[PDB]
Amino acid sequence: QGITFSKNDVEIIARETLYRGFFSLDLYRFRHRLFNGGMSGEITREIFERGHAAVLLPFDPVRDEVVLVEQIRIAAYDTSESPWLLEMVAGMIEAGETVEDVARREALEEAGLEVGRTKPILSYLASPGGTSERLSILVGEVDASTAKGIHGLENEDIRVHVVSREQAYQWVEEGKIDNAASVIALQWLQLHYHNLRNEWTK
Amino acid sequence: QGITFSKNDVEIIARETLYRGFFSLDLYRFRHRLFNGGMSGEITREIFERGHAAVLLPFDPVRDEVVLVEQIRIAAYDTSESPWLLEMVAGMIEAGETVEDVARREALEEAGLEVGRTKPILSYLASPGGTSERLSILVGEVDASTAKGIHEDIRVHVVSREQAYQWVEEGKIDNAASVIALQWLQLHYHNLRNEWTK
Numbered sequence: 001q002g003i004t005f006s007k008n009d010v011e012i013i014a015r016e017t018l019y020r021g022f023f024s025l026d027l028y029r030f031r032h033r034l035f036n037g038g039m040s041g042e043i044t045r046e047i048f049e050r051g052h053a054a055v056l057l058p059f060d061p062v063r064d065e066v067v068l069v070e071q072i073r074i075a076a077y078d079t080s081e082s083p084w085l086l087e088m089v090a091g092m093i094e095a096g097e098t099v100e101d102v103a104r105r106e107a108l109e110e111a112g113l114e115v116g117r118t119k120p121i122l123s124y125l126a127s128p129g130g131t132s133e134r135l136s137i138l139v140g141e142v143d144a145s146t147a148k149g150i151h152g153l154e155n156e157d158i159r160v161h162v163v164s165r166e167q168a169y170q171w172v173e174e175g176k177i178d179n180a181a182s183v184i185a186l187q188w189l190q191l192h193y194h195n196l197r198n199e200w201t202k
Numbered sequence: 203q204g205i206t207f208s209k210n211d212v213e214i215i216a217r218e219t220l221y222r223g224f225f226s227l228d229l230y231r232f233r234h235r236l237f238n239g240g241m242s243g244e245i246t247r248e249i250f251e252r253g254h255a256a257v258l259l260p261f262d263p264v265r266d267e268v269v270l271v272e273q274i275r276i277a278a279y280d281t282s283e284s285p286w287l288l289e290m291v292a293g294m295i296e297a298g299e300t301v302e303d304v305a306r307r308e309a310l311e312e313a314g315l316e317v318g319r320t321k322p323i324l325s326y327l328a329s330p331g332g333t334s335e336r337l338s339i340l341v342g343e344v345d346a347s348t349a350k351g352i353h354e355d356i357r358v359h360v361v362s363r364e365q366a367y368q369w370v371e372e373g374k375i376d377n378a379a380s381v382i383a384l385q386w387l388q389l390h391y392h393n394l395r396n397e398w399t400k
């Protein structure tokens with residue numbers, strides 16, 4: 001059961017940068033084994049390269065509350081009612097950094113929050129047909145009574161919102177929260193909150 | 203309650219396509235209202251533009267089974283054990299096409315599955331800091347005993363819902379579309395099975 005082939009079964013022949021900016025778009029050239037027993041010819045694919053991210057679900061297990069951050073994401077404009085989105089604390093992971101270090105720094109910068117205990121949620125590929133981006137989600141213990149106000153640096157303007165867990169999940173169901181990181185984190189929380197609250201309120 | 207500002211509160215000054223091949227790399231220049239009052243300066247952002255997708259979770263409510271499709275996704279290589287991923291059926295939405303039409307077509311093309319009833323799951327932005335992509339997920343009723351074969355090189359897998367969900371927990375399924383769909387299924391399968399096996 002499970003997948004069929006490993007890295008022994010694919011060769012990346014070359015990568016060619018197509019666009020070099022803040023992010024990049026690369027052409028990967030590769031060959032790989034086929035399910036029918038053969039080898040592919042040389043395949044090329046365009047891949048959006050933007051590094052990888054740490055994501056923090058700020059959860060108050062005493063109050064059963066979730067902290068959301070609101071900020072504009074202009075890429076949402078063409079398909080969304082508003083480009084202002086309700087999201088998880090998050091940031092890019094630079095060389096040598098840990099997911100936790102980034103999550104804690106961003107919790108302070110984006111939401112004014114200290115974080116207590118932390119546990120992994122899941123690490124996922126955002127859209128692996130066209131981007132390499134991986135985002136690694138943690139849940140972080142917070143005191144939601146300390147979450148409030150306007151944060152961010154400059155080019156960054158972020159409003160904190162505090163909701164109950166059930167309210168946040170209702171917002172997912174209704175489409176008011178509709179970005180992958182937040183949907184994944186809040187679905188996970190709906191599946192795990194009973195044990196998590198028990199663990200963190202012993 | 204909820205969000206603070208609307209499209210009346212942002213001005214998109216310019217858009218440019220800086221790279222066009224199979225996909226596009228766009229540059230947006232804009233200014234927007236600030237929470238404390240007033241308007242930002244001009245901001246520029248690179249946006250990966252690839253259109254939008256329909257996704258189908260193939261669920262057999264009689265058997266409590268899901269059909270997964272396996273194919274190489276080279277973008278996964280640098281951060282994954284293998285670039286071959288277990289995924290939901292999916293495809294691009296072309297002009298004037300509906301999510302449902304694309305989902306049903308891709309289920310046949312990628313997995314050989316006829317779909318019965320469908321229901322919406324959720325529609326989500328994959329990574330809206332850097333890509334415009336939206337994906338809209340449906341759950342589709344299938345007979346998993348009909349799913350087999352090779353179907354772009356794609357292998358069809360049938361597993362119990364419980365195994366697919368445990369693979370999410372274990373990190374063996376770790377692409378957004380599948381994680382979202384299977385967590386939704388874990389939250390909703392009991393009512394869905396009742397609804398579809400009357």
Ligand SMILES: Nc1ncnc2c1ncn2[C@@H]1O[C@H](COP(=O)(O)OP(=O)(O)O)[C@@H](O)[C@H]1O
Pocket residue numbers: 044045046047129130224292293294354
């Ligand atoms: N990253 C990419 N770069 C270049 N071409 C692509 C890429 N992804 C998909 N395509 C083209 O689209 C076709 C169908 O895409 P597919 O592999 O089914 O992925 P998806 O269904 O997510 O678009 C492929 O055979 C390929 O020719």
Ligand SMILES: Nc1ncnc2c1ncn2[C@@H]1O[C@H](COP(=O)(O)OP(=O)(O)O)[C@@H](O)[C@H]1O
Pocket residue numbers: 022071072091155156157246247248249331332
């Ligand atoms: N899509 C993008 N295009 C260009 N630059 C970006 C993009 N995303 C992030 N950056 C750069 O990285 C910085 C930190 O990213 P982030 O805090 O996620 O964005 P924002 O400032 O919009 O909240 C931004 O201030 C910006 O300078």
